[PDB]
Amino acid sequence: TCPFYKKIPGTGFTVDAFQYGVVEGCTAYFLTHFHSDHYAGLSKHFTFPVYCSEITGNLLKNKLHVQEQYIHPLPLDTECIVNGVKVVLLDANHCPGAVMILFYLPNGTVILHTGDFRADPSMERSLLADQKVHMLYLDTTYCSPEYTFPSQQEVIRFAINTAFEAVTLNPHALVVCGTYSIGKEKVFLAIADVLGSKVGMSQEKYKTLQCLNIPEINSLITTDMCSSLVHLLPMMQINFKGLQSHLKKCGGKYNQILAFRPTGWTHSNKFTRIADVIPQTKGNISIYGIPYSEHSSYLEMKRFVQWLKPQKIIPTVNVGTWKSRSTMEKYFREWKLEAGY
Ligand code: NI
């Protein structure tokens, strides 16, 4: 049964609600982005209208084989009418194709659903600036002050300089980057650009990347592993055993691996500056864990919400425990009293 925080009152609409069978009263199903916790339940047998971005629609058609007649892509930053309700899709600064959705209810209420997002001050100059929002359905993944991490720009700087140093010291080193979903493509693309290489990968991952409208992508990626000195591997293989086994397959082309594991936040963020990060090393294999996040830090979240001044907030992440829910409500009240709304 579909939970309340996936339903949009006063409409026939649901958001990221594909795993509950046929939802009673739902005339249009919105999908914020192509991550499996959110698309869970879609397939080629789905026969209700799906509303999403153009990129999310390319992935629905090519990866899950949803038939074209049920896929309704919408342009961003553009007022659209769906089943007689005005909607707009905004960039969520999450993974490729990820959107937030503004719904303009017939009774005059305005609702923003952020999907998954990384809040940024640049959102304060989108179409959000123009009007009041009554209810916010908020990605609260890191809604606690302990959750600090660097900008994406600082993390990429660390990774490019680390990779370029290693391979200039040893021209026979291979760089490996872990992946399990779309998102975080800047990690491997930035590293391959500084090394003058294409990124090599499996046929299934190359397929996924071809759906993403990334400029000049044919120049950046390849399924020919032998021509490439940056390889992508499934995240599960990013460990000493998996990497040893990969090096064996490269036919004595390489004598060292440097590997990156993009994570979200980890507790070593509570102690160590990005500058000071060191790898785990066994023999000729080193593994860096780097805190590349596609969700808001606590401070980024707080700034967006205090700017938006919503009348009511409905969390969409960490809603399963009483202690979580109570923690989040406390922070929302602090933010409200501090800013005066
Ligand atoms: Ni996500």
Side-chain angles (χ1 to χ4, degrees), residues 303-311 313-323:
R303 178 186 168 111
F304 177 82
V305 174
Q306 290 179 312
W307 171 83
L308 197 71
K309 302 176 176 60
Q311 291 182 356
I313 305 176
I314 294 155
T316 67
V317 187
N318 305 309
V319 303
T321 78
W322 301 110
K323 185 179 168 210

Side-chain angles (χ1 to χ4, degrees), residues 33 35 38 94 116 295:
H33 68 292
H35 279 167
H38 300 260
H94 186 53
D116 281 350
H295 297 273

Side-chain angles (χ1 to χ4, degrees), residues 40 51 173 218 314:
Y51 285 85
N218 295 331
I314 294 155

Side-chain angles (χ1 to χ4, degrees), residues 262-269 271-281 283-309:
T263 65
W265 171 93
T266 71
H267 191 54
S268 47
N269 278 278
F271 302 129
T272 321
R273 262 162 165 70
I274 184 57
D276 299 318
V277 165
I278 64 181
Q280 292 188 230
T281 294
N284 60 351
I285 306 186
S286 291
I287 305 169
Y288 283 90
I290 60 174
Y292 193 95
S293 178
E294 284 184 344
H295 297 273
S296 313
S297 71
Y298 171 88
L299 291 168
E300 291 159 356
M301 195 189 303
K302 177 179 184 282
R303 178 186 168 111
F304 177 82
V305 174
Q306 290 179 312
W307 171 83
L308 197 71
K309 302 176 176 60

Side-chain angles (χ1 to χ4, degrees), residues 156-177:
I156 293 306
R157 178 93 283 190
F158 174 84
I160 286 170
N161 290 359
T162 300
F164 178 76
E165 188 187 300
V167 170
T168 303
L169 297 170
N170 179 195
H172 301 276
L174 174 63
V175 177
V176 180
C177 292

